[PDB]
Amino acid sequence: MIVILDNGGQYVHRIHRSLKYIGVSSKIVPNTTPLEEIESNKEVKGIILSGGPDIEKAKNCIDIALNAKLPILGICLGHQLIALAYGGEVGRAALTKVYVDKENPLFKNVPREFNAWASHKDEVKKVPEGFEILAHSDICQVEAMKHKTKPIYGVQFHPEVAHTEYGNEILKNFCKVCGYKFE
Ligand SMILES: [Zn+2]
Ligand SMILES: [Zn+2]
Ligand SMILES: [Zn+2]
Ligand SMILES: [Zn+2]
Ligand SMILES: [Zn+2]
Ligand SMILES: [Zn+2]
């Protein structure tokens, strides 16, 4: 099972439907849910930090990003909250051409280029120390990132919206990082 923290986004339920599509169970919990409550259920293989409109209503994701033993994927706001947590810089900014520099876990079975959706207004300007950039666009330097040694992933785009090319494959890939096999 995957736990999804509700950061208020209008597409949070779409993450739960996308996971079910690829055969993965998920539960939408409040973003005030403590880590010790998520990590005590032995069937949780991973945490997703959802998108949302207000980063001030989602700062519990900070501690989760720093303390989780489980793998973490941040989407949009969740991606930003990961950057803030580890001391990276976040600043002011829909269909974007995304260039994959490191096929890493996240972009295996995805083309080197693809179109990704997000109307964000805030982006990651500098990746935290001990992170690396996996993907960028023409203008913006960080479209997706990972900690170099921890299973912590962020994507500025929403892979749970149809408008995003290969979005279910990117979610499937994070599930592979969470120890899911498929065949
Ligand atoms: Zn359901
Ligand atoms: Zn968003
Ligand atoms: Zn590049
Ligand atoms: Zn963008
Ligand atoms: Zn941007
Ligand atoms: Zn930019």
From Swiss-Prot:
Keyword annotations: ATP-binding, Glutamine amidotransferase, GMP biosynthesis, Ligase, Nucleotide-binding, Purine biosynthesis
HAMAP family: GMP_synthase_A
Keyword Nucleotide-binding: yes
Pfam family, one: GATase
EC numbers for this chain: 6.3.5.2
Role, per record: Catalyzes the synthesis of GMP from XMP.
Main EC class the enzyme belongs to: ligase
CDD domains named among the record's database cross-references: GATase1_GMP_Synthase (cd01742)
Encoding gene per record: guaAA
Gene Ontology MF, one: GMP synthase (glutamine-hydrolyzing) activity
Metabolic or biological pathway, per its Swiss-Prot or TrEMBL entry: Purine metabolism; GMP biosynthesis; GMP from XMP (L-Gln route): step 1/1
Entry-linked Gene3D superfamilies: 3.40.50.880
Domain Glutamine amidotransferase type-1: 1-183
Entry annotation: catalytic residues: 76 (nucleophile), 158, 160
Protein's UniProt name: GMP synthase [glutamine-hydrolyzing] subunit A
InterPro entries xref list: Class_I_gatase-like, GATASE, GMP_synth_GATase, GMP_synthase_A
Subunit structure: Heterodimer composed of a glutamine amidotransferase subunit (A) and a GMP-binding subunit (B).
Catalyzed chemical reaction(s): XMP + L-glutamine + ATP + H2O = GMP + L-glutamate + AMP + diphosphate + 2 H(+)
